[PDB]
Amino acid sequence: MDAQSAAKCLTAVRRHSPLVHSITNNVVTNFTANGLLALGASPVMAYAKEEVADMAKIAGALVLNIGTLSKESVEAMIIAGKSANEHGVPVILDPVGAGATPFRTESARDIIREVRLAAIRGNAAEIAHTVGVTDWLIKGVDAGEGGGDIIRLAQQAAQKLNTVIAITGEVDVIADTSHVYTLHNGHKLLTKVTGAGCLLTSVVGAFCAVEENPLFAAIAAISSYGVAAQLAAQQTADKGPGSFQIELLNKLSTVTEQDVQEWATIERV
Amino acid sequence: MDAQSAAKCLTAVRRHSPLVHSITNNVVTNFTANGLLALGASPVMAYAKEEVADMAKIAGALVLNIGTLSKESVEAMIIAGKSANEHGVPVILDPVGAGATPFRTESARDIIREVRLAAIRGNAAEIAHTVGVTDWLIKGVDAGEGGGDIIRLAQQAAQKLNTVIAITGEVDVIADTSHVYTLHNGHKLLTKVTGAGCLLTSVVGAFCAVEENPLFAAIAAISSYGVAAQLAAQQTADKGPGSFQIELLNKLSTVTEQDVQEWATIERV
Amino acid sequence: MDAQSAAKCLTAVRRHSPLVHSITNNVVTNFTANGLLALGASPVMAYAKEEVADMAKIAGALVLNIGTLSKESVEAMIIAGKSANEHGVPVILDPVGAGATPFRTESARDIIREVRLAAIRGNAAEIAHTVGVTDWLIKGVDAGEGGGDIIRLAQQAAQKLNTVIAITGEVDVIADTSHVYTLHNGHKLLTKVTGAGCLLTSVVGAFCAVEENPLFAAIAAISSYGVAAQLAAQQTADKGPGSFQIELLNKLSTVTEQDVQEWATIERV
Ligand SMILES: Cc1ncsc1CCO
Ligand SMILES: Cc1ncsc1CCO
Ligand SMILES: Cc1ncsc1CCO
């Protein structure tokens, strides 16, 4: 895929306005919903065991996030995932905090055993503890803590689970069983807005609802989000993280196809 | 009622600063509270069964919203409603998603059987499944999917439950047992801000706390909110949904009596 | 302590970026996290009984808030507090609504019996019902409902629990077993932003993670927050509470040491 192609998937999402069902944490519910609305999609949050199966079956995509998990919410995520798997609705997982505490690592591993996933998104450490692999990294600072080792972790995980693995960082690495790509987009102010990464996972869900190949959907989602963020930072930079949060939402609704073609960097490895 | 009268109820709300108790969904808690504070009221959220009855009895109004309901939260809403009914505190209901899943339709019907309501607010479909009536509509696009049929649904529901029914849309229809009105106010950017409709339901609650006739309170609440939204969009328009959300809050605190008299359209049918 | 000293603790917080674990209400989760990120700290929310002990032990500080409490969340706060007490992590408590309903007063008293606290923050009424003392006051209006009586309540509570007591109001009163101070900072627009007080409690937590004497940490935290708020209001004033919320976040990230030295008023009694 290329910048031109990613830009086309963005226009598709806006034309179809897919329904994205989220079972997420309570620190990012409002931001995630506002971001999806700004982008042009339709968000819906539902967590009760008596309704998740019914809501998941009528959605375009299902997004699972364990940020502030509980025994009952993990049980609901699995019931919802099974329902989506039965009706052909792509499911995306964000294993927030996997590795930080055993309860999170356990819940993450349980979900991947019971639900077939179209994609998994998180930092290096979160992905390694979820799949149970090697190569350890949190995010990195400068120079280079290892690029080939991250590329290797991504491919190994993707091959074992037969899904798409997107490891985010200053440089994004995305891969499926037989392909690997590195992405250069975004701005550091995204680290000062809670839920920024989570919103990205939901946007990936929106793109998967309109593009059949999950690898292409993920690449187009991450490239579009990153360009919106950079353009927002240019207008937001020395004002602060408060103004950036608001301008990010504005840009998610005004970013064009030409913008993505000009500022998104996609490289096949 | 007229624009002049609606404008007077707004000044009343600001003078009394009523305490509005909300039992709502976790996607709109922060926005709903900030909007009520901006308007000039006092919000309070409490959901535990061991305290809802005590909190409801000291409030000026009670607002129930099933956006992200659970078995226990529906039970709490009913305990709270019964307490308010015992101490003369008006109760308002927003049956979010009624009809979307059977669990939501069931919970909505259970609440209206056990609690006496001053008003119910939602779209056409939500109102029809909650009361169990005819006439089906989601929101409409252009031309006219039927105005008289919506007017009929509103009056039928209002007569059966002896309460006020407010069906929102590009054109708002409000009615009680013997009166019907259509309202023309607002801006479409309200559809790009999550919780915008919910905030409106809470504002109706604030107005009911200071005006004895619930039909008049609802008309004045919806007219004032809509004018604040239009004035915000004029200053927010080509910047985006992010800037609009912030300007809506600003306008809820600066909108005047003259503003409402000039831009709110109220028509008795 | 003085303005010069408080300013130094601010730079410390930004250099260390402490991890602050919050077990709080769902009306202020997003705002609290964004404020901590803006300030320069690292927030983490976790509420499940199967993980709070593990998360608390690796944090720099623990913050407990009963704003929208439940039977299970109070149980979790206590398990988390015990763990922090075992690993030397300072714990801060915000007894939101203590006195409003017996369930809140009871839960607040249970926490102070089971957990050793570095500090407690709330209004006069909340502090009196939590500790079970005299002197009653909500916030005050003008003239003077009693300054010496508030000073007395603070010292009595601090002596009995051997902790720091911070009673907020137009004038802030902070004290420990043998010292008392009054602080003059902030702006009234903080009352129009939900979670403003709660964010302050979390900021106190961030400062306690880097300064050994909790009294000094609290003084420096409250002075810095108040100066950021005043500077934001100067740029936000006649636009509204919406713009202020956003500018407050901006200022929490741009406020300097010189700013605090110039606009914070600290007086030892
Ligand atoms: C997006 C969303 N999901 C359940 S409630 C809600 C807020 C708008 O009612
Ligand atoms: C409005 C509200 N209700 C319970 S907590 C809260 C946030 C301010 O403490
Ligand atoms: C700060 C925070 N705590 C648990 S989830 C979360 C949102 C970012 O994932």
Tab-separated table of N, CA and C in Angstrom, chain C residues 182-265:
chain	number	residue	atom	x	y	z
C	182	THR	N	-1.979	29.661	55.734
C	182	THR	CA	-3.133	30.095	54.949
C	182	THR	C	-2.564	30.432	53.571
C	183	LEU	N	-3.280	30.051	52.517
C	183	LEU	CA	-2.833	30.293	51.145
C	183	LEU	C	-3.838	31.134	50.363
C	184	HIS	N	-3.324	32.079	49.583
C	184	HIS	CA	-4.157	32.964	48.775
C	184	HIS	C	-3.767	32.807	47.308
C	185	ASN	N	-4.529	32.003	46.575
C	185	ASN	CA	-4.261	31.762	45.160
C	185	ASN	C	-5.505	31.203	44.473
C	186	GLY	N	-5.473	31.137	43.145
C	186	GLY	CA	-6.596	30.584	42.406
C	186	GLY	C	-7.550	31.592	41.795
C	187	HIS	N	-8.634	31.082	41.218
C	187	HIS	CA	-9.645	31.920	40.588
C	187	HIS	C	-10.995	31.218	40.719
C	188	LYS	N	-12.071	31.995	40.803
C	188	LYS	CA	-13.401	31.412	40.947
C	188	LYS	C	-13.895	30.580	39.769
C	189	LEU	N	-13.302	30.751	38.590
C	189	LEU	CA	-13.738	29.949	37.450
C	189	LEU	C	-13.464	28.459	37.696
C	190	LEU	N	-12.672	28.138	38.722
C	190	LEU	CA	-12.405	26.728	39.021
C	190	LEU	C	-13.698	26.035	39.483
C	191	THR	N	-14.661	26.810	39.982
C	191	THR	CA	-15.933	26.233	40.435
C	191	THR	C	-16.875	25.880	39.273
C	192	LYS	N	-16.527	26.295	38.056
C	192	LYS	CA	-17.364	26.011	36.889
C	192	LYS	C	-16.813	24.871	36.033
C	193	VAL	N	-15.768	24.211	36.522
C	193	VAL	CA	-15.157	23.095	35.804
C	193	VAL	C	-15.199	21.874	36.725
C	194	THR	N	-15.987	20.869	36.360
C	194	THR	CA	-16.107	19.689	37.203
C	194	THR	C	-14.772	18.948	37.299
C	195	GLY	N	-14.427	18.540	38.515
C	195	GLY	CA	-13.181	17.827	38.731
C	195	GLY	C	-12.005	18.736	39.042
C	196	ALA	N	-12.237	20.045	39.048
C	196	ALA	CA	-11.157	20.989	39.333
C	196	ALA	C	-10.539	20.708	40.699
C	197	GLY	N	-11.389	20.448	41.696
C	197	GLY	CA	-10.899	20.194	43.060
C	197	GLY	C	-10.243	18.821	43.143
C	198	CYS	N	-10.871	17.880	42.513
C	198	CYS	CA	-10.331	16.552	42.472
C	198	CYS	C	-8.901	16.649	41.830
C	199	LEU	N	-8.761	17.280	40.620
C	199	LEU	CA	-7.417	17.429	39.970
C	199	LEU	C	-6.427	17.956	40.965
C	200	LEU	N	-6.816	18.942	41.763
C	200	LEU	CA	-5.925	19.469	42.787
C	200	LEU	C	-5.439	18.384	43.757
C	201	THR	N	-6.338	17.501	44.183
C	201	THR	CA	-5.956	16.427	45.099
C	201	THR	C	-4.894	15.518	44.470
C	202	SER	N	-5.047	15.231	43.179
C	202	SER	CA	-4.106	14.382	42.457
C	202	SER	C	-2.751	15.074	42.293
C	203	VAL	N	-2.769	16.389	42.095
C	203	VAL	CA	-1.531	17.150	41.959
C	203	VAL	C	-0.780	17.078	43.297
C	204	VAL	N	-1.522	17.128	44.402
C	204	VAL	CA	-0.909	17.040	45.730
C	204	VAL	C	-0.200	15.691	45.795
C	205	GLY	N	-0.839	14.661	45.241
C	205	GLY	CA	-0.244	13.335	45.222
C	205	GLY	C	1.079	13.330	44.474
C	206	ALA	N	1.107	13.986	43.313
C	206	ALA	CA	2.314	14.075	42.491
C	206	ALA	C	3.459	14.755	43.244
C	207	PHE	N	3.149	15.825	43.976
C	207	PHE	CA	4.174	16.536	44.745
C	207	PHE	C	4.681	15.705	45.934
C	208	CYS	N	3.794	14.930	46.557
C	208	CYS	CA	4.179	14.088	47.697
C	208	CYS	C	5.123	12.961	47.277
C	209	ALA	N	5.092	12.627	45.992
C	209	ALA	CA	5.933	11.573	45.451
C	209	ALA	C	7.380	12.025	45.315
C	210	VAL	N	7.609	13.335	45.353
C	210	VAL	CA	8.961	13.867	45.212
C	210	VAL	C	9.468	14.672	46.413
C	211	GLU	N	8.575	15.027	47.336
C	211	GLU	CA	8.964	15.784	48.530
C	211	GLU	C	8.590	14.999	49.787
C	212	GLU	N	9.587	14.706	50.620
C	212	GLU	CA	9.379	13.928	51.839
C	212	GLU	C	8.426	14.496	52.884
C	213	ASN	N	8.456	15.804	53.108
C	213	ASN	CA	7.555	16.405	54.086
C	213	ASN	C	6.218	16.683	53.401
C	214	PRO	N	5.172	15.922	53.754
C	214	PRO	CA	3.853	16.115	53.143
C	214	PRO	C	3.244	17.517	53.285
C	215	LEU	N	3.565	18.229	54.364
C	215	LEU	CA	3.038	19.583	54.550
C	215	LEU	C	3.610	20.508	53.476
C	216	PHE	N	4.913	20.398	53.230
C	216	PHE	CA	5.570	21.218	52.216
C	216	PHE	C	5.079	20.845	50.816
C	217	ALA	N	4.909	19.549	50.574
C	217	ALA	CA	4.442	19.076	49.276
C	217	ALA	C	3.070	19.657	48.964
C	218	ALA	N	2.177	19.594	49.946
C	218	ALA	CA	0.822	20.102	49.791
C	218	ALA	C	0.814	21.605	49.541
C	219	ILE	N	1.643	22.338	50.279
C	219	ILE	CA	1.702	23.781	50.103
C	219	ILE	C	2.181	24.121	48.698
C	220	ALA	N	3.224	23.433	48.237
C	220	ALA	CA	3.773	23.688	46.909
C	220	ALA	C	2.814	23.279	45.790
C	221	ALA	N	2.073	22.196	46.002
C	221	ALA	CA	1.117	21.725	45.007
C	221	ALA	C	-0.045	22.713	44.842
C	222	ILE	N	-0.629	23.124	45.961
C	222	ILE	CA	-1.758	24.047	45.938
C	222	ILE	C	-1.382	25.438	45.414
C	223	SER	N	-0.172	25.896	45.726
C	223	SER	CA	0.285	27.200	45.249
C	223	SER	C	0.506	27.191	43.731
C	224	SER	N	1.140	26.136	43.221
C	224	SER	CA	1.411	26.011	41.788
C	224	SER	C	0.123	25.880	40.976
C	225	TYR	N	-0.800	25.057	41.463
C	225	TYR	CA	-2.078	24.862	40.777
C	225	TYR	C	-2.840	26.189	40.723
C	226	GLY	N	-2.908	26.868	41.860
C	226	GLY	CA	-3.611	28.141	41.929
C	226	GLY	C	-3.054	29.219	41.016
C	227	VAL	N	-1.735	29.258	40.849
C	227	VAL	CA	-1.125	30.259	39.981
C	227	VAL	C	-1.420	29.929	38.518
C	228	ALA	N	-1.403	28.648	38.182
C	228	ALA	CA	-1.707	28.240	36.820
C	228	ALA	C	-3.151	28.648	36.509
C	229	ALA	N	-4.036	28.474	37.486
C	229	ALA	CA	-5.445	28.819	37.305
C	229	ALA	C	-5.656	30.326	37.109
C	230	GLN	N	-4.966	31.139	37.903
C	230	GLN	CA	-5.107	32.588	37.775
C	230	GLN	C	-4.598	33.067	36.409
C	231	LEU	N	-3.425	32.592	35.996
C	231	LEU	CA	-2.863	32.986	34.704
C	231	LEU	C	-3.770	32.557	33.544
C	232	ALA	N	-4.440	31.421	33.706
C	232	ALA	CA	-5.352	30.922	32.680
C	232	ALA	C	-6.600	31.802	32.614
C	233	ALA	N	-7.101	32.207	33.777
C	233	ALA	CA	-8.288	33.049	33.821
C	233	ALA	C	-8.029	34.420	33.184
C	234	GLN	N	-6.811	34.942	33.316
C	234	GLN	CA	-6.495	36.252	32.734
C	234	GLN	C	-6.647	36.179	31.214
C	235	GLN	N	-6.240	35.053	30.631
C	235	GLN	CA	-6.331	34.862	29.184
C	235	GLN	C	-7.698	34.306	28.758
C	236	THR	N	-8.439	33.751	29.725
C	236	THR	CA	-9.759	33.104	29.533
C	236	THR	C	-11.019	33.843	29.976
C	237	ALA	N	-10.852	34.739	30.935
C	237	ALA	CA	-11.938	35.505	31.539
C	237	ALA	C	-13.293	35.728	30.834
C	238	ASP	N	-13.364	36.629	29.858
C	238	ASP	CA	-14.676	36.865	29.259
C	238	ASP	C	-15.126	35.974	28.097
C	239	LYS	N	-14.407	34.880	27.876
C	239	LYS	CA	-14.781	33.935	26.831
C	239	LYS	C	-15.730	32.898	27.442
C	240	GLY	N	-15.410	32.422	28.647
C	240	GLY	CA	-16.279	31.449	29.297
C	240	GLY	C	-15.579	30.252	29.925
C	241	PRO	N	-16.328	29.425	30.673
C	241	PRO	CA	-15.811	28.232	31.352
C	241	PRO	C	-15.278	27.168	30.399
C	242	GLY	N	-15.775	27.164	29.164
C	242	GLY	CA	-15.280	26.200	28.200
C	242	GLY	C	-13.823	26.505	27.871
C	243	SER	N	-13.548	27.754	27.509
C	243	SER	CA	-12.189	28.165	27.163
C	243	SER	C	-11.225	28.077	28.353
C	244	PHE	N	-11.737	28.315	29.557
C	244	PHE	CA	-10.920	28.255	30.772
C	244	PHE	C	-10.417	26.843	31.034
C	245	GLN	N	-11.298	25.862	30.872
C	245	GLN	CA	-10.920	24.470	31.090
C	245	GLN	C	-9.704	24.134	30.229
C	246	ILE	N	-9.759	24.511	28.953
C	246	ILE	CA	-8.666	24.243	28.020
C	246	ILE	C	-7.409	25.042	28.350
C	247	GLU	N	-7.565	26.308	28.728
C	247	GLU	CA	-6.395	27.120	29.054
C	247	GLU	C	-5.745	26.670	30.380
C	248	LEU	N	-6.534	26.101	31.288
C	248	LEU	CA	-5.982	25.607	32.554
C	248	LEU	C	-4.989	24.489	32.230
C	249	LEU	N	-5.386	23.569	31.356
C	249	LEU	CA	-4.488	22.489	30.965
C	249	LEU	C	-3.223	23.068	30.324
C	250	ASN	N	-3.383	24.033	29.415
C	250	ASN	CA	-2.219	24.661	28.774
C	250	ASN	C	-1.254	25.238	29.816
C	251	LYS	N	-1.790	25.993	30.772
C	251	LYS	CA	-0.958	26.622	31.800
C	251	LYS	C	-0.276	25.639	32.754
C	252	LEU	N	-0.915	24.506	33.016
C	252	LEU	CA	-0.295	23.512	33.886
C	252	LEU	C	1.017	23.018	33.257
C	253	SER	N	1.126	23.125	31.936
C	253	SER	CA	2.338	22.683	31.257
C	253	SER	C	3.332	23.814	30.988
C	254	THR	N	2.859	25.061	30.946
C	254	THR	CA	3.762	26.184	30.681
C	254	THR	C	4.128	27.067	31.877
C	255	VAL	N	3.431	26.927	33.005
C	255	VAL	CA	3.736	27.758	34.177
C	255	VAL	C	5.166	27.506	34.652
C	256	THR	N	5.883	28.593	34.930
C	256	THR	CA	7.281	28.526	35.349
C	256	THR	C	7.548	28.751	36.833
C	257	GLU	N	8.820	28.631	37.198
C	257	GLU	CA	9.243	28.831	38.573
C	257	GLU	C	9.088	30.310	38.927
C	258	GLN	N	9.419	31.187	37.982
C	258	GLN	CA	9.300	32.625	38.213
C	258	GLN	C	7.835	33.001	38.462
C	259	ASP	N	6.928	32.395	37.694
C	259	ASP	CA	5.494	32.658	37.832
C	259	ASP	C	5.012	32.382	39.253
C	260	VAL	N	5.375	31.214	39.776
C	260	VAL	CA	4.974	30.814	41.118
C	260	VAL	C	5.556	31.740	42.187
C	261	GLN	N	6.804	32.153	42.002
C	261	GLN	CA	7.464	33.055	42.942
C	261	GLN	C	6.749	34.412	42.993
C	262	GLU	N	6.215	34.841	41.855
C	262	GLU	CA	5.548	36.132	41.759
C	262	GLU	C	4.072	36.200	42.138
C	263	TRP	N	3.316	35.133	41.899
C	263	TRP	CA	1.887	35.183	42.189
C	263	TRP	C	1.305	34.300	43.289
C	264	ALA	N	2.134	33.509	43.961
C	264	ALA	CA	1.633	32.649	45.035
C	264	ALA	C	1.828	33.344	46.377
C	265	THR	N	0.787	33.323	47.206
C	265	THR	CA	0.818	33.960	48.520
C	265	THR	C	0.731	32.901	49.618
